[PDB]
Amino acid sequence: SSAHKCIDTNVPENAACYRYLDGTEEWRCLLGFKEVGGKCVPASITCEENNGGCAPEAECTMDDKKEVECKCTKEGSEPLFEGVFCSSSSG
Known about the structure:
Elements: E1 15-19, E2 25-29, E3 33-35, E4 40-42, E5 59-62, E6 68-71, E7 79-80, E8 85-86
Antiparallel strand pairs: 1-2, 3-4, 5-6, 7-8
PDB class: cell adhesion
Keywords: malaria, surface protein, surface antigen, glycoprotein, EGF domain, cell adhesion
Assembly: monomeric
């Protein structure tokens, strides 16, 4: 939905932003970038640090393409912005 699109946050370059229904807005760097001094700069990622950039609730791995993959294992939640964010699911 569009209810999740940020509307009151200055989003850094190379970052994603998610607006929660309670009005909260949070941004995070896109896969491949690391937060350095309030900015998202290019970096060499490793699932062993900050979960590879994947959402805290996601699983980080390496596929055949030797690239990072984020998956929201919970049944009901999906990966937004390639998994930088994991949708929330009903109970």
